[model samples]
Target chain A: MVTAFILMVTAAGKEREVMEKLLAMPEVKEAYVVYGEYDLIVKVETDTLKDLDQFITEKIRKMPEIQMTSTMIAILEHHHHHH
Target chain B: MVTAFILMVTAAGKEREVMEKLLAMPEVKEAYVVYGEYDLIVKVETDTLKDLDQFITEKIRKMPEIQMTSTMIAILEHHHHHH
Candidate 1:
């Protein structure tokens, strides 16, 4: 899977709305409202880079509430389970 | 805790070396070598943003094998369990 983490800056007061919309999308497996330079952190998985790009351009970037977005695509990932 | 995902670009032919170095860091909970705009993806956890910034500046960014890095600090996260 082509997994990516998209950091987003949203219009003031629209974080919740944008986050809910993101969670509703199938490609967006996980999302959260963040406090920092960016407002939202989203995790998405796609079958290919082309699909990831399309999803970002057509779905994510197109959102009215989104002011800016930075995408970080993962080439490899290892998750640790702490007992 | 504060969590961040760092996307890194490495010197040519130095990805494995960089990955091993990152995996050895205490703050680096997960590390991966990926194929995309970036060469590696690293997951880290810190007590605060200042600590996160310091860790990146002192340890990650200072590495000779790393060319560039983009950090996305996560304010919230969710993990799904499918049985």
Candidate 2:
């Protein structure tokens, strides 16, 4: 599996809406509006790197509110959830 | 709840080990070794900004393997799951 963190810049006042669209996508594991250089951050996973590229280019890039994005692909992942 | 992404730079070959220690902490929700300027990215959650500050300075910062960190705090959260 290929996992990546996509940091995004969105149109003003559109962070929450963009986050909602991202969260509704199957490949987007997590999405949040953040206070930083980037407006939002999304966790995405795909079966292969090619799939990831296509997903980002076709799905994420097509989002009207998103202005720009930077992706950091993971080499290994460890998750611990405490709810 | 307060959530932040902590991008970490670890000692050479210590990414996995550092990730393990992070996962053992209740505040760390997810961690990954990634190919980028940063060695690992950690998702952390706490009750308040004060708690987050304390957790990073006291817990995360004290890890011997970690060399540096950059934090981005989240302002809004959205969730959706597809299995």
Candidate 3:
């Protein structure tokens, strides 16, 4: 799976509304309204990088209320542990 | 260095200004205003977690313009090693 942590900067006083819209979407795994330089943090997962790219580019990025977004793709490591 | 990814949520249209302020700070290594749930993603490095705590608590969390923050301390960063 392609996992991405997307940081969103929103317009003033729009966190609740934005979060509602995002949470309603299937791809959004986790969403929260946070404080600091951005308004919300969203965790997204898709089958592939291309799928993630299209989802962000076509769906998330095109939101009229969203001012901007920064995406960080998490790279997983291989580990073997016997329990 | 203790590396932490700080996610910030800001008021709309204030992202660029927030980025400026964060970038000017000593602890902030990289700050980007992005789209999605969080408005900006900041990579902060400090000598200790205590230092990071102080920085984020006193400097970032207290910012009036910022809406909220969610901090995730990276455990181990891995990548596809190269030649």
TM-score of chain A of each: 0.87, 0.87, 0.84
Chain A only, candidate 1, TM-score: 0.87
Regions more than 4 Å wrong, model 2: A75-83, B80-83
TM-score of chain B of 3: 0.88
TM-score-wise, the better of 1 and 3 is 1
Tens digit per residue, CA lDDT, model 2, A17-58: 899888879998888788877898889999878889999889
Interface C-alpha RMSD after superposing true interface residues, each candidate, one decimal: 3.3, 1.3, 10.0
Name the candidate that leads on DockQ. Answer: 2
Candidate 3 iRMSD, 1 decimal = 10.0
Pairs of residues clashing in candidate 1: A75-B34
Locate the minimum summed-lDDT window of 10 residues in model 3 chain B: B74-83
Docking class of 3: incorrect
TM-score each candidate: 0.70, 0.82, 0.51
lDDT of 2 by residue, B1-83 (tens): 88899887889999888889889999999888887667888998899999998987878767878988878899877643333
TM-score of 1: 0.70
lDDT of 3 at A1: 64
Scored by TM against the true chain B, the candidates give 0.88, 0.88, 0.88
Which parts of model 3 have CA positions greater than 4 angstroms off?
A1-83, B79-83
Taken over the whole model, the C-alpha lDDT of each candidate is 0.78, 0.84, 0.73
Candidate number of the best TM-score: 2
What DockQ would you assign to candidate 3?
0.05
Off by over 4 Å in 1: A35-37, A75-83, B34-39, B79-83
Candidate 3 lDDT over residue span A2-52, tens digit each:
667876778887776777777777888756675545667677778767888
